[PDB]
Amino acid sequence: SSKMDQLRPVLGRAGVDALWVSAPANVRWLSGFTSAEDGKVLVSPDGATLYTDARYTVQAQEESSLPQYIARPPATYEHAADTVRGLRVGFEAESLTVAELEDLRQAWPNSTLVALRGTLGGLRAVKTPEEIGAIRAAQDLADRVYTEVRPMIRAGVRELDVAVEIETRLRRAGGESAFELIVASGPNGAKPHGHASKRVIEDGDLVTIDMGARLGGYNSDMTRTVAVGTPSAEMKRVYDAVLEAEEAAIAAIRPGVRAADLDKLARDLLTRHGLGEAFAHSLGHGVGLEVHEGPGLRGTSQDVLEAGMVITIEPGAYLPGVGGVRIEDLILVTEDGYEVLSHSAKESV
Amino acid sequence: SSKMDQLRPVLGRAGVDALWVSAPANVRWLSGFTSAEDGKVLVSPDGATLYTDARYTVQAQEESSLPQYIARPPATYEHAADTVRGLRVGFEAESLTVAELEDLRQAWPNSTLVALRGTLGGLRAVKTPEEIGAIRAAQDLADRVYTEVRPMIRAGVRELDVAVEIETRLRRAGGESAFELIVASGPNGAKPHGHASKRVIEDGDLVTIDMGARLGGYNSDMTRTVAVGTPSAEMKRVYDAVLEAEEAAIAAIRPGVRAADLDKLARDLLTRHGLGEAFAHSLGHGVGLEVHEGPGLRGTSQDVLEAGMVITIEPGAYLPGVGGVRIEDLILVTEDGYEVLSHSAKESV
Ligand SMILES: [Mn+2]
Ligand SMILES: [Mn+2]
Ligand code: NA
Ligand code: NA
């Protein structure tokens, strides 16, 4: 099915006649426009139109699968007004500011603006071959840079300086770091939400490297933990347990599997190995135009995996004050299983 | 005056009894909390409270000048509800999403939520000595890195690689690039909104470097243009005109001067030197917790400079297809004039 034909039944079920698309990832998903922060799309009974300004005339003509109307706000949505007269027009309430909604309400007095909250969550969950190709290119860049930087990860090096080297090489390659880099050594390994500090890596530390590349608008995401010297017996057990959990959850991926059941498989396994008050509260997430997008692999998830989805699998176990381990791979769901896209080594410790 | 005593009369004039502060820069401005994306402040007739979750208990106790209530959303604003019963509660409509407003409306059914749009613009325009000190530290880092990287800017080097070197050194120093770096050489100098491309710098090019450092939460901002080899007679005239405009506008800074009149001084000067269909449409902006904040130096501005404000002055002239020049300094308004905070050399071409 075409993207528009995927979207329209979702709008029907949501009880709207039209949709003002303002989230940059959904503007780009629908239209192909790659400067989507400066575009908007109106989906309506008359079709679908990309709105952007005259700086982007040539670029939008070349990129957009949708006809274009060229103007700056507020001319864009004022021009759109007659198209939406008498209609229920959905908008993306998790994205749109109150001021932006006020602007639309003033411009469309003969329309009913309808807030959509979770409605479009996971709209982009299934990727086309072209999209998968772009994600592969991003992840291949991430793997190349990780493999280049890995030998620098040794005693005497600051976490921060490992992160700098990763960022440097991603940028020199024409990409960028997809999110704030995590290089978490020793007790810093036990803090999720920690990034890369000035802490110097020492012999006996595990080091967790959580990184991704954004390249051509698409993201990748992986996590590795490595040993510098010989870790404690305890941190080795932690590492082996998390690796066991990761490889077990990956091996259950197939069309039709419930995201929540993957989460349960990992938490049960960690619990059997003594780590069931220590683990991460989501197992993973979709990756695409955003680093974090649908589906979600929480215990409460109602998502069901299908072929073409790209997700992470990332069990984690944290021992506050001591250390912690995360290991994550980027996975493509296939017609009868999965394909691991992230190829960097997973080492023993 | 204290920050709260600055804010309360603004709220009075705006016709509200209370304010839900959600913009991270204003959460931090009022409270001192430095992880302000994960905090909110309620200003009310009962006082002012910082809301954040238990991950931040110790940090918020140490940092916050305001009492704290520790919880995750929605417990935070549900706990706040009885404080705002019967009140007109302002919220920051340019920041808050529609979904976030819906959440507050459900939690505060006996309150009236009042959208504030431009109300708090320039709230943070005047800086304290401590704030100025933080901005000086950021700009000093920017100057140090610019001076280190300047000699690499030569024929044969990609724009992108100059940007990478800047980013690398800012990050290694414990800061970061404040915004997407611009290194614009040759005809790329004529494109505002261009950043750093793979274009190789050549003899005869001007190169425009637009950069800032974020350090300890505060930003800096400057722009330099330099010559690689000998530029055309025309681009030299452009450079000299823009430098003349910049130094003229800076020299008019004092308490009481109108931001719009600074803009007029620069556009008149560029027009006298043949560049009055070529120039930038704002002369500059405040800098602080955000790179772009009040005041604004557009022709339509109603802002008036006062002592303690930190602003940029940045005339620009662009010759599409040929080249362009921007030059910018970061300026502190003083009791009877100004002080230039950005110290990097401004060269002849
Ligand atoms: Mn990761
Ligand atoms: Mn600048
Ligand atoms: Na991954
Ligand atoms: Na400046």
mmCIF file of C-alpha atoms in Angstrom, chain B residues 136 246-257 262 305-311 313 329-343 346:
data_model
loop_
_atom_site.group_PDB
_atom_site.id
_atom_site.type_symbol
_atom_site.label_atom_id
_atom_site.label_comp_id
_atom_site.label_asym_id
_atom_site.label_seq_id
_atom_site.Cartn_x
_atom_site.Cartn_y
_atom_site.Cartn_z
ATOM 1 C CA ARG B 136 32.253 35.415 28.965
ATOM 2 C CA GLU B 246 29.320 46.432 12.076
ATOM 3 C CA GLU B 247 31.671 48.836 13.786
ATOM 4 C CA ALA B 248 29.255 51.752 13.251
ATOM 5 C CA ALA B 249 26.280 49.905 14.782
ATOM 6 C CA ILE B 250 28.376 48.682 17.715
ATOM 7 C CA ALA B 251 29.518 52.264 18.394
ATOM 8 C CA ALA B 252 25.881 53.398 18.832
ATOM 9 C CA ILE B 253 25.152 50.887 21.613
ATOM 10 C CA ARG B 254 24.209 52.452 24.948
ATOM 11 C CA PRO B 255 21.333 52.218 27.435
ATOM 12 C CA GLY B 256 18.244 53.733 25.869
ATOM 13 C CA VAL B 257 19.133 53.226 22.241
ATOM 14 C CA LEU B 262 20.633 50.280 15.275
ATOM 15 C CA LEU B 305 18.683 48.355 25.034
ATOM 16 C CA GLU B 306 19.598 48.563 28.722
ATOM 17 C CA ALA B 307 22.694 47.894 30.767
ATOM 18 C CA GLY B 308 23.420 44.211 31.275
ATOM 19 C CA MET B 309 21.921 43.036 27.991
ATOM 20 C CA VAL B 310 24.048 40.787 25.807
ATOM 21 C CA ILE B 311 23.441 41.039 22.075
ATOM 22 C CA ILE B 313 25.570 42.859 15.940
ATOM 23 C CA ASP B 329 30.486 40.447 17.621
ATOM 24 C CA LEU B 330 28.946 39.644 20.972
ATOM 25 C CA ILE B 331 28.306 42.857 22.939
ATOM 26 C CA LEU B 332 27.569 43.700 26.557
ATOM 27 C CA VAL B 333 25.577 46.902 27.100
ATOM 28 C CA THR B 334 27.163 48.905 29.934
ATOM 29 C CA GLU B 335 25.962 51.869 31.976
ATOM 30 C CA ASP B 336 27.343 54.385 29.457
ATOM 31 C CA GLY B 337 28.223 52.377 26.388
ATOM 32 C CA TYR B 338 29.269 48.858 25.491
ATOM 33 C CA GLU B 339 31.952 46.204 25.859
ATOM 34 C CA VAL B 340 32.826 43.804 23.035
ATOM 35 C CA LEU B 341 33.050 40.294 24.515
ATOM 36 C CA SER B 342 34.193 38.470 21.371
ATOM 37 C CA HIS B 343 37.897 39.095 20.991
ATOM 38 C CA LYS B 346 38.895 40.920 12.543
#
